[PDB]
Scaffold this motif. Sequence first.
Motif, PDB file in Angstrom:
ATOM      1  N   UNK A   1      59.562 -12.112   7.811  1.00  0.00           N
ATOM      2  CA  UNK A   1      60.280 -10.852   7.977  1.00  0.00           C
ATOM      3  C   UNK A   1      59.625  -9.737   7.172  1.00  0.00           C
TER       4      UNK A   1
ATOM      5  N   UNK B   1      73.383 -12.384  14.094  1.00  0.00           N
ATOM      6  CA  UNK B   1      72.136 -11.605  14.037  1.00  0.00           C
ATOM      7  C   UNK B   1      70.945 -12.385  13.503  1.00  0.00           C
TER       8      UNK B   1
ATOM      9  N   UNK C   1      58.207  -6.158   8.437  1.00  0.00           N
ATOM     10  CA  UNK C   1      58.527  -4.874   7.825  1.00  0.00           C
ATOM     11  C   UNK C   1      57.267  -4.140   7.389  1.00  0.00           C
TER      12      UNK C   1
ATOM     13  N   UNK D   1      55.859  -2.026  10.313  1.00  0.00           N
ATOM     14  CA  UNK D   1      56.735  -1.066  10.949  1.00  0.00           C
ATOM     15  C   UNK D   1      57.773  -1.642  11.884  1.00  0.00           C
TER      16      UNK D   1
ATOM     17  N   UNK E   1      63.992 -10.150  12.627  1.00  0.00           N
ATOM     18  CA  UNK E   1      64.292 -10.889  11.408  1.00  0.00           C
ATOM     19  C   UNK E   1      64.273 -12.380  11.707  1.00  0.00           C
TER      20      UNK E   1
ATOM     21  N   UNK F   1      61.177  -2.781  11.921  1.00  0.00           N
ATOM     22  CA  UNK F   1      62.378  -2.733  11.101  1.00  0.00           C
ATOM     23  C   UNK F   1      63.569  -3.393  11.784  1.00  0.00           C
TER      24      UNK F   1
ATOM     25  N   UNK G   1      70.241  -7.075  20.408  1.00  0.00           N
ATOM     26  CA  UNK G   1      69.660  -8.227  19.735  1.00  0.00           C
ATOM     27  C   UNK G   1      69.822  -9.486  20.577  1.00  0.00           C
TER      28      UNK G   1
ATOM     29  N   UNK H   1      64.703 -22.147   9.514  1.00  0.00           N
ATOM     30  CA  UNK H   1      63.575 -22.977   9.897  1.00  0.00           C
ATOM     31  C   UNK H   1      63.876 -23.686  11.215  1.00  0.00           C
TER      32      UNK H   1
END
Lengths: 265, 266, 266
Positions: free
Chosen positions: A122, A150, A126, A129, A134, A131, A38, A138
């Motif tokens: 987000x 994360x 999803x 696809x 995220x 997943x 990430x 703002x």
Amino acid sequence: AALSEQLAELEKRSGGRLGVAVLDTATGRRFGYRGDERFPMCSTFKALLAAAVLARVDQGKENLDRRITYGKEDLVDYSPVTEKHVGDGMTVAELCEAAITYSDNTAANLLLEALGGPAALTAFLRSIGDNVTRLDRWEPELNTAAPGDPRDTTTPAAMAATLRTLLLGDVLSPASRQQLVDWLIANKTGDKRLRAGLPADDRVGDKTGTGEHGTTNDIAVVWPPNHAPIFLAVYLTESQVDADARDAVIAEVARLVVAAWVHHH
Amino acid sequence: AALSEQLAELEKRSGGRLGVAVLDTATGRRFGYRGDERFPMCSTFKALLAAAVLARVDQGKENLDRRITYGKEDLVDYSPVTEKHVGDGMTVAELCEAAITYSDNTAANLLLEALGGPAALTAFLRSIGDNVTRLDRWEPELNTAAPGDPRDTTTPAAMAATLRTLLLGDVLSPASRQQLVDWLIANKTGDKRLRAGLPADDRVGDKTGTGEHGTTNDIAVVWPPNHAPIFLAVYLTESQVDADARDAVIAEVARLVVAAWVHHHH
Amino acid sequence: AALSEQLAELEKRSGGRLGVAVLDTATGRRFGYRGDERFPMCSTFKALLAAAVLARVDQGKENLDRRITYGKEDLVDYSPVTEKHVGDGMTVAELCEAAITYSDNTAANLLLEALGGPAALTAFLRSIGDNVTRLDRWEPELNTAAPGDPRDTTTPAAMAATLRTLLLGDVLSPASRQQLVDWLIANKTGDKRLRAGLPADDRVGDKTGTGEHGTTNDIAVVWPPNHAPIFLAVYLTESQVDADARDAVIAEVARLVVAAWVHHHH
Ligand code: NA
């Protein structure tokens, strides 16, 4: 693999963490260096933001001509386009153009409330696809890029796969796929990053990202001559070199990737 | 327009920011005074909350007869109906009726819980083409009405267009549309606002809103005799006169709009 | 009802607040003791989390074989499985198995991310007609179990009814229904709770929950020999007895419920 060793050396020189993903749609070949880790996406999320808006335009729930007005209290930093139209407002299409080609932060905030907020973005991801990606905050808070956080992150492999789906899949109508491609091709923020290292005859669309903790990102779709598109996601964070050197790292990644690919042929 | 100038003077006397939107479905005529500026909607959102609940009922994901129980610790301020049913609870229908006709705050919180939160209400509004209105907080924090804060805001034009789609469009079932209309017509909190300035033979339903920073709102659907409905959304905020005078500002807006409409004809 | 009197006295021995719901799918009979009141879910939500992930697998938007990697700093407390795969990562199926059978907390956070957050789980529950259960926070904060806090709560009746629709209804495909059943049957954390008090020939799947303020929960689907499934949701919070005695309260609920059902049949 020589490319992975080259990127590990480039990463060591940068002093931070480097993530690279390549997706060649002509071959299906994929390459990743920390491709499943990430990274703070920063303003690279605005490419996905415009896609979610265009999807709503496809659904008849949104109109590109719809005018949005705002006050001078609604401006946040790095809004070179929206700072000029406090009096007349801007259309949704003009806000998406500013958010992508100039990385206008207020335009992104106005488009986010047009969607319903970061959770709505987000949810759209999803829905196609993705997943992994995220968005949580703002502008400008989503650019904090704190290590171990994360929030507002993606992985290079997920981002490259999502753009391939957005630009080449059945998520958006053919009209909105072309519009999103046109906006990315008209970007003015990435002359020093992936575009700098790519061959001049390559058709390029890209969206950049910059954040705290030495974060420098660039995401591109590349059309070589008579060649299917290549998708490229580069993320650099926690780096100790200055702003110009961080851009050169991204440009260096481009040169290393192109030079890895001249061997596959 | 003389109406725009009249509202400008009334806004000056209020000392705050006045927003007005008119939507006449008999002719299609629209009018706006700051109709595209954001205003803290406060309790006027409860009309949209009830519509979102009814949509899920039409969806048969929800039942108007479903009973919800709660403790006294769940009560927030100004909850005149829900405070009387800590023992026996209330049905979803009774909560919607309490939230609209008496502006019961705890009833709104329980219905928001039934939706899944303020973001669920915003998502419903996005699903029906309202890309402007947003709910972000629960009762009573959604009423702070701070200037420059976009949370829990709408514009006059967006709220009027959304009320039109909910009451006239086909977002809700015919039964659900009539139910929301019946709740709004039965409102008890807005006698000193838009209803006060409207002609007596007008059939009217409305929903009030009141908040900090001198905020006084009222949205309404008005049926003149033998006339298609007119949708009216009035928001006043940052006003410097007391609550009674702010109600009078809303009543005067109704008088001015009616006077402008009769001049439009005769 | 004698069972109500018995659960009343047992609640008082626990020193806290006890909630019980029974759903017998053979007859449709349902029983509740505080079945309408909200209780902190804690890890009992992970059964619904796995269902929401399985629903997306049914939709083709998720793959059980998809690998998820994470770092040492991503681990939260009570993560016996996820702490052994910082190097190689784990698949979605492996994360669901760890979240359910070992109540792994980091596995639940990774799966919540795959959904899009607690609000995404709440949205899934609203989509299947559960207008009561809500998840608001991540691990480990959702286990705070503060009295009067509606965050991360359900009611016994809502959880039993939701577990019933997930395992027997049309929400999930038959393949994912069987997968969720197999995970619950393979639970390793509930040997001292509901399973302890049930007859040995009963086939049991369950998901436990444990939190602060003496919170001890367990939800189960029980197959008696040649009998339709029975669903049982038991929540205990604000208890004054130690961890072993709280476990014994849950086991005693199972004994009391089975004995009452013995009287129903004879
Ligand atoms: Na009560």
